[PDB]
Amino acid sequence: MGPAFEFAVAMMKRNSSTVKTEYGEFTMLGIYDRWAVLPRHAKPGPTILMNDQEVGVLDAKELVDKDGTNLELTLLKLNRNEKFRDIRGFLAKEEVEVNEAVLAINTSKFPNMYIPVGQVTEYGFLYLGGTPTKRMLMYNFPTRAGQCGGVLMSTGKVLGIHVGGNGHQGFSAALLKHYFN
C-alpha cells in the first residue's frame, strides 16, 4: 500500500488539479498536451475553474465504445499555454487488476486525500444510475458522492477514474491508453 501511496502523492502533485464546473467540484487528471479527463457527471461548460482560475474549454468528448455504450468519462481539451506532463505511459492498454490500490481525491471537501481500497478487479458491464456502462473496475469503498473524479492508482499505474459506488464497492472507469491521441 505504501509504494502505491508514494506513487499516488507524486502523481497527484504533478498531474492533478481541483476543478469546478456548474455541476460540482471534481478531481481532474491532466494526461498530455492540453488534454485532461473528468468523470462524465462533471458536465464541463465552455469555462471551468481549475485551481480557482477560469480556463477555457476547447473540446469535450463523452467517451463511448464502438457500439455507443457509455464509458462514463469525459475528455476535455483546455485552452492553456502549458502542457501537462505526459503520463500516457502510466495508462494501460486494457483494464488493470491489482492487489493493492489507492484512490486519490483533490478537492475542497477532500483536499489532497488518499484512501486505500485494496484489490481492484475488472467488473466490466454495469448499470450506472439507469445507464448501461462498460469497462468498470471495482474495489472496496464505503460509498460517498464527492469522490467522483478520484484517481485510482497502484505502484507505477494509473488505473481509472472513480465514477460511483453502491455503499460497499466503488467503481472506476478504466483509463486506457488508446483514449489518448
Kindly list the catalytic residues.
41, 72, 148
Binders of a second copy in range 7-66 (CB under 8 A): 9
Residue 93 or residue 168: which is nearer to a second copy going by CB? 168
Do residues 125 and 134 touch, judged by C-beta distance below 8 A?
yes
Q: How far is the CB of 118 from a second copy (least distance, A)?
A: 10
> Buried b / exposed e across 52-65, counting CB within 10 Å, b at 16+?
eeebebeebeebee
Count the neighbouring beta carbons within 10 Å of the beta carbon of residue 24: 17
Q: Which set of grid coordinates corresponds to residue 75?
A: 475528455
Question: C-alpha angle with apex 77: 65 to 98, nearest 5 degrees?
Answer: 50
Q: How far is the CB of 143 from a second copy (least distance, A)?
A: 8
Q: Which stretch binds a second copy (CB under 8 A): 37-45, 56-64, 71-79, 113-121?
A: 113-121
Burial of residue 131 (number of CB atoms within 10 Å: 0-12, 13-18, 19+): exposed
Q: Can residue 115 be called a binding residue for a second copy (CB under 8 A)?
A: yes
Binders of a second copy in range 118-147 (CB under 8 A): 142, 144
Element (H or E) spanning 82, and its range? none
How many residues at the interface with a second copy, by CB under 8 A?
18
Residue 68 or residue 167: which is nearer to a second copy going by CB? 167
Binding site for a second copy (CB under 8 A): 1-3, 5-6, 9, 105, 108-116, 142, 144
